[PDB]
Amino acid sequence: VSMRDMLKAGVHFGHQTRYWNPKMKPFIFGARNKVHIINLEKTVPMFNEALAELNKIASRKGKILFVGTKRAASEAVKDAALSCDQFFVNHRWLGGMLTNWKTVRQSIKRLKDLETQSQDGTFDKLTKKEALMRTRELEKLENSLGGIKDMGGLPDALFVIDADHEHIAIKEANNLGIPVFAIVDTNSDPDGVDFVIPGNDDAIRAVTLYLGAVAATVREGRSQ
Amino acid sequence: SLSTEATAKIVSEFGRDANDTGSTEVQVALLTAQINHLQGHFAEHKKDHHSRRGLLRMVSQRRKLLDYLKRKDVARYTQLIERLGLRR
Amino acid sequence: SMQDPIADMLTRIRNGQAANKAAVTMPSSKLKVAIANVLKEEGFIEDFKVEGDTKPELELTLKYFQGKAVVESIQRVSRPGLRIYKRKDELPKVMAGLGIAVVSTSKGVMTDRAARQAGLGGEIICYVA
RNA sequence: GGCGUAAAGCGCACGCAGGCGGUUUGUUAAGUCAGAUGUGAAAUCCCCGGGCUCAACCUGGGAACUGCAUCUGAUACUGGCAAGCUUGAGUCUCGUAGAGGGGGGUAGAAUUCCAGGUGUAGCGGUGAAAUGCGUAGAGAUCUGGAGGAAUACCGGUGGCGAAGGCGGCCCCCUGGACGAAGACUGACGCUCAGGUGCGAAAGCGUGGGGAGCAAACAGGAUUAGAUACCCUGGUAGUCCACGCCGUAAACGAUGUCGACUUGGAGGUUGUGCCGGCGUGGCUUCCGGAGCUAACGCGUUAAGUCGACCGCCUGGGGA
Known part of the structure; x- marks a missing residue:
């Protein structure tokens, strides 16, 4: 990754000067049409060192959680984690997925038995009506836990999209000292993230750019 | 207020050039002239309290300037209050 | 003012x-x-x-x-409303020694440590920690 | 230790005494600091020991007596003195906005009354009524006049003022605030007990005025009762001039002044540059850190400091 691709994909394209966060004055050069421009020289080294940390944590067989819920990137993030051998959460986050893992573990156990009931012929011995509720449980729990069914232990690091949108997940991960990575707009906060990476995450191009670069570095780290 | 010509006249008569307005002598002369003018205004307008407050402000500012001059130079203070008939 | x-x-x-x-x-x-x-x-x-x-x-x-x-607690001690003076025998210790008490003495503005070593009292300007 | 809401910021201001005081140099050494000398009685207290078989107790020596005076030094800080400096404060030039104040005049809308024209059995009021007004002609409607008070729209959590407060329009007299460039003085400052002044409405005194409104009062209702609520009237008073009173939930329940400390959504008035890029003031709302008991405050602080003032110390009594 480098400055030219970031400017091509609108990484510098942040939010309005009215939505600017008080804590992101350094990460911005100036203004144009009342839209703040995320500094692109401050982005490359910080993004690259966050990528290098992701690569290093990929050597220790360390798990990574990809977090992003908005509809613009749901398929993009759900693929960027599916082709990374790492778990994700891309739909409506259940608060307490990390701090209260001792109940959603029972939830995913019920989900696993209900989804082995999918390939079991179970939805044939019931009177064509309970199958509706079981299939709806399948649907809702797959939406809620679409990547962490085989998670098998709290994730080691948290790579997130739109840090402000996922502040519940961010603060949960902070509550246990888990390294947290944020694709964070100017309108969002760096206080809950130990690795702040200023960069747009509404531009689907920028989301794909960050996801692809981090996938490349994490796959490189996990190769060895 | 004092007309522009009156202000210029007092500054020239009390300043040590055509452009010396901030000196204590010029300031006290201006304050005294304004008070002497305002006495006639408040003879007719004993109920003009809002302007009398500003007149008393001028009085107090002049008193402080005279006290400052007196501790600064007795000779200029005596000359100044002689040139005006100021009681003290 | x-x-x-x-x-x-x-x-x-x-x-x-x-x-x-x-x-x-x-x-x-x-x-x-x-x-x-x-x-x-x-x-x-x-x-x-x-x-x-x-x-x-x-x-x-x-x-x-x-x-x-770096500075945790920095506080004015001798103020215009209340001037504070200490003899060398009774100089204060800030944070039981970890901080300093900036003491203007007759040989310049120095800490409580330097004032105590030099055998001098003085005005207690400020505490720093 | 406190003072937004628990008790607590004087209603506001000016100001003497007092308290405090931007920056530079030299000097002094008063405060400050070092050392000494003298004194600080003994005892007591404390420490190290001694004697009563121990202890209490007695006892040797020391320390302490935190203080005062004198002397000799040091000069960082405060003070005195002398000279500077301009950034606090202030004066001058031009310009800006304002219901800032006093006095005078004028205008239109509306109410009441008086006169008249047209016209006839209602009007008015209420939850429903009645009191009341009207056949002596009301109400309605049209015209003329008298008079008093207040100034629709504009009008804006707009503006100005220390606070109280200030609202049609014009004029005369007049206070303050602010801004752009400069010019000038050179700490002349801040706060302020006592003191002085101002200070809503009601009220008081003297003399005017009196439309509307309306304490008191009267009547009609309501009601178990109704010295009220509602209705019909209606006098002080509200208006004016002068004097007095000196109090309000006089409130931001938040003293003044100065310095410093993330943001955002609106409105307001100057000045620079080509509707945009700035620059000074003000104002409304949310909100971060921080603070708070919380509510909340939050660059217009209730955050971090400094100067000074005022005030509080359980409830009642009071």
Whole structure:
């Protein structure tokens, strides 16, 4: 990754000067049409060192959680984690997925038995009506836990999209000292993230750019 | 207020050039002239309290300037209050 | 009106450290320069400098070690409303010794340590920690 | 230790005494600091020992007696003195906005009354009524006049003023605030007990005025009762001039002044540059750190400091 691709994909394209966060004055050069421009020289080294940390944590067989819920990137993030051998959460986050893992573990156990009931012929011995509720449980729990069914232990690091949108997940991960990575707009906060990476995450191009670069570095780290 | 010509006249008569307005002598002369003018205004307008407050402000500012001059130079203070008939 | 420039300087230092300001620029005085000397020679701030002939300006570069501010508690002790003087026998110890009490003595503005070693009392300018 | 809401910021201001005081140099050494000398009685207290078989107790020596005076030094800070400096404060030039104040005049809308024209059995009021007004002609409607008070729209959590407060329009007299460039003085400052002044409405004194409104009062209702609520009237008073009173939930329940400390959504008035880029003031709302008991405050602080003032110390009594 480098400055030219970031400017091509609108990484510098942040939010309005009215939505600017008080804590992101350094990460911005100036203004144009009342839209703040995320500094692109401050982005490359910080993004690259966050990528290098992701690569290093990929050597220790360390798990990574990809977090992003908005509809613009749901398929993009759900693929960027599916082709990374790492778990994700891309739909409506259940608060307490990390701090209260001792109940959603029972939830995913019920989900696993209900989804082995999918390939079991179970939805044939019931009177064509309970199958509706079981299939709806399948649907809702797959939406809620679409990547962490085989998670098998709290994730080691948290790579997130739109840090402000996922502040519940961010603060949960902070509550246990888990390294947290944020694709964070100017309108969002760096206080809950130990690795702040200023960069747009509404531009689907920028989301794909960050996801692809981090996938490349994490796959490189996990190769060895 | 004092007309522009009156202000210029007092500054020239009390300043040590055509452009010396901030000196204590010029300031006290201006304050005294304004008070002497305002006495006639408040003879007719004993109920003009809002302007009398500003007149008393001028009085107090002049008193402080005279006290400052007196501790600064007795000779200029005596000359100044002689040139005006100021009681003290 | 402005009546305690020394406490004003301590307040500017404290506010900058609470605001995470990099440096603070203020009108310069010889006593302010002396307290900045004492603070720099004890590591509480990074460095100082002065700009200006008729109106010198004192700019102190603050330091922060682990994100957090270096100076924890900096407090005016002897004030215009109440001047505080100590003989060498009864000089204070800030933080049981970990901080300093900036004591102007007859041999210059120094810490409580240097004043105690030199066998001198003096006015207790400020506590730093 | 406190003072937004628990008790607590004087209603506001000016100001003497007092308290405090931007920056530079020299000097002094008063405060400050060092050392000494003298004194600080003994005892007591404390420490190290001694004697009563121990202890209490007695006892040797020391320390302490935190103080005062004198002397000799030191000069960083405060003070005195002398000279500077301009950034606090202030004066001058031009310009800006304003219901800032005093006095005088004028205008239109509306109410009441008086006169008249047209016209006839109602009007008015209420939850429903009645009191009341009207056949002596009301109400309605049209015209003329008298008079008093208040100034629709504009009008804006707009503006100005220390606060109280200030609202049609014009004029005369007049206070303050602010801004752009400069010019000038050179700490002349801040706060302020006592003191002085101002200070809503009601009220008081003297003399005017009196439309509307309306304490008191009267009547009609309501009601168990109704010295009220509602209705019909209606006098002080509200208006004016002068004097007095000196109090309001006189409130931001938040003293003044100065310095410093993330942001954002709106409105307002100057000045620079080509509707945009700035620069000074003000104002409304949310909100971060911080603070708070919380509510909340939050660059217009209730955050971090400094100067000074005022005030509080359980409830009642009071």
